[PDB]
């Protein structure tokens, strides 16, 4: 007879469970990226950030969810035409805490 | 000492696990709604559809993910200015298979 | 005198009316099975799928009408020599929505 | 003759340099604790949080600097009579990112 394999979102969405956590998006600096105020960002800290990845980082002691740009220069760029990029020069401190792998949007 | 309580997406996102399943969105008839081609739609079939809910439905034997409109007339309307609404008259058969509660977008 | 008992297709073809629905076949992956593009598949969801039954299922969020194979391994196999079987391994999710009990072919 | 051994703040203040970072304090929910808006909090993530420790934590996806209370119940309590405690029940998710070991106040 057939057996219904019940849905398991951790197996489907999470690769490294012991290093995965969720951060709630704030503001609309990343709306064009699909990230809106209130959404859940599933963050994996066991994977190393690359050019293009959206990361949870701390610039000069302040956290933000931005798109990592390593070339031509290290920068944290938004995905909203109204916001401006953040350059990471030598007097600044960049700290990446994980790569956002999924965005969970609620509908009701 | 303190002990970390690991993330559990099922507890966080699913209410009726025995009647919840995921459908993969197709095309872009629902982009303004936040649903894009490829996204996972978490569907709950244990809740009854209401006006405004985004549902997985079959109209005349063909499946679709659309927004249910019961007033002023029963219709399945997209969320893309380029697509047109579907009226459900008496010669047509509507069949709702569940309400989309969350959209999981991947960021790689 | 004789009384003509008018034809009633629901009584003749449908066993569980409250759980029976119709899906329109797509493509020709099941032509050898007698299912062709456009035909109506009368689906009963109140009956549990067995080896050999033709089912409406969702594999990784995508719907299909295929023949259920449980032995020697779970597989969704077509009925067209040109199409290839689908194995349902542990990283995959199978979801059966009902057993096709009849096929309605139109003639004009 | 005598040779002066220059000051080194890392040797003096940091124990695990590979897991130490600085977070800039926000608001005044922790003023009685000596932490004021703008101060640098030197955070060590290589040490496990205990009752009484001031930690950098994320409750339901939102970051905060609070005092960890494990007894009688797990709570995140401020150090400002005007703010109220945060209980961490089962429907809530606590995530500790490190213990604050020092507060650097600037005098200009």
UniProtKB/Swiss-Prot annotation, chains A, B, C, D:
Keyword Hydrolase (UniProt): yes
User: What keywords were assigned to this record?
Assistant: Autocatalytic cleavage, DNA damage, DNA repair, Hydrolase, Protease, Serine protease, SOS mutagenesis, SOS response
For biological process, the GO terms are:
DNA repair; proteolysis; regulation of DNA-templated transcription; SOS response
Q: Which GO terms describe its molecular function?
A: DNA binding; serine-type peptidase activity
**Active site (UniProt):** 29 (for autocatalytic cleavage activity), 66 (for autocatalytic cleavage activity)
Going by the entry's taxonomy, the superkingdom of the source organism is recorded as Bacteria
Enzyme Commission designation:
3.4.21.-
Role this protein plays: Involved in UV protection and mutation. Essential for induced (or SOS) mutagenesis. May modify the DNA replication machinery to allow bypass synthesis across a damaged template.
The family note in this entry says: Belongs to the peptidase S24 family.
Name of the protein described by the UniProt record: Protein UmuD
Task: Name the species this protein comes from.
Answer: Escherichia coli O157:H7
Source lineage: Bacteria, Pseudomonadati, Pseudomonadota, Gammaproteobacteria, Enterobacterales
Q: What residues of the intact protein does this structure contain?
A: 32 to 139 of 139
